[PDB]
Design a protein around this ligand. Structure first.
Ligand SMILES: CC/C(=C(\c1ccc(O)cc1)c1ccc(OCCN(C)C)cc1)c1ccccc1
Ligand SMILES: CC/C(=C(\c1ccc(O)cc1)c1ccc(OCCN(C)C)cc1)c1ccccc1
Lengths: 213, 214
């Protein structure tokens, strides 16, 4: 219903805050991130409810979308924070880790490097905040009819941002392609992430349902 | 390679297309799929070498891109040929499985329904052959690009090719970048399905370098 520019403003206003973290072992480092993550998830839900077209979906669909996309969203949020910190990841203002410390957790050295590669790619493209919030909304809606019309609106919005940037048509859809292809790499990183979290001993849906309702 | 046109890009990719192989005739499942995939893999190497700008890369990079994308390439091919067979996957012309047949297969418990939905998606989008071969080429160059400027230059060109096909088809410019977005978002799902497959298979850098010595 809305215009390409008020879509930007609405999403920007719905942006979650940057939370603070609470040598490392494997269990203490994953304790830090899990905590930050679970705190971060509360704010993600409130953000999702303010993404245009989300609350119009059934509760069953809202939960399902967040359930499959939550790690993707945390990761692209992490990458966005670490953009101006080459060779490092900004989990929190009080938790900036280089590649060296990432070996505290086994199997995390691979995922770590994939996040750093994404961060450099965003810097190479000089990703804007107006585009970032658009990419993040797409992730929430795509990873899981009405949804596609909303997704089609975000595409127009992204194009609108690139057209106002002074870009000709060729560089516009080229950049659009470049951006969306990164999401495939983000999905990949999430998949490898779920594995590791599954490779651990023992409520998201409970948290999702509790806060969404 | 960077100086081709959209029509020359399409023409090169279409003639680079691998043949649809058959499952081994033996009247008297993962074994059949493994056998089929390994024979398909040999044709994939020949195809990849015909993808514009792929041979401009080093031998090491060619191996890396293929080891990262091979299952995605096989899966999108599976989805493509299963398009006009609703609610059923066409692994081979003589190996056609529907859902209940597929539910009883090793670890295809998750991806079968995903592959069908992807096939449903392409069908209701009316995916053209010219678009398909473009998407498959994109997969080849993009899957391992993060795990280099020439690669992104070829990708941008395949993007230019896709847009041209949509403009010629008679789509408005708004419909053009919308369709392009839809197609590329699907690649995320295909990446997702591949990961699910790789894991199950996990329970190479070698053989590729062997095949590309040709
Ligand atoms: C990439 C860092 C990370 C997590 C993370 C990323 C971004 C962010 O802002 C916060 C954390 C991470 C770690 C643990 C985690 O667990 C939450 C789920 N619990 C309830 C099991 C989630 C994300 C991670 C995820 C999986 C495996 C290893 C590490
Ligand atoms: C989706 C069907 C499939 C295979 C397949 C897909 C498309 C195609 O055209 C042909 C086959 C599949 C099955 C086995 C397989 O193994 C080859 C590698 N071997 C040496 C381990 C590859 C793909 C599969 C992949 C992973 C797990 C379970 C099934």
């Amino acid at each position: 219903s809305l215009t390409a520019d008020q879509m930007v403003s609405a999403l920007l206003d719905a942006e979650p805050p940057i939370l603070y973290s609470e040598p490392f072992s494997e269990a203490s480092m994953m304790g830090l991130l899990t905590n930050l993550a679970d705190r971060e998830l509360v704010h993600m839900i409130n953000w999702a409810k303010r993404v245009p077209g989300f609350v119009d979906l059934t509760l069953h669909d809202q939960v399902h979308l967040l359930e499959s996309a939550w790690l993707e969203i945390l990761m692209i949020g992490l990458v966005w924070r670490s953009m101006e910190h080459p060779g490092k990841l900004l989990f929190a203002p009080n938790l900036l880790l280089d590649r060296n410390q990432g070996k505290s957790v086994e199997g995390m050295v691979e995922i770590f490097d994939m996040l750093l590669a994404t961060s450099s790619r965003f810097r190479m493209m000089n990703l804007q905040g107006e585009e970032f919030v658009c990419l993040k909304s797409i992730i929430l809606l795509n990873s899981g009819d009405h949804i596609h019309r909303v997704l089609d609106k975000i595409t127009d919005t992204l194009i609108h941002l690139m057209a106002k940037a002074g870009l000709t048509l060729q560089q516009q859809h080229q950049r659009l392609a470049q951006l969306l292809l990164i999401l495939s790499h983000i999905r990949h990183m999430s998949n490898k992430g779920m594995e590791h979290l599954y490779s651990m001993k023992s409520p998201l849906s409970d948290l999702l349902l509790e806060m969404l309702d």
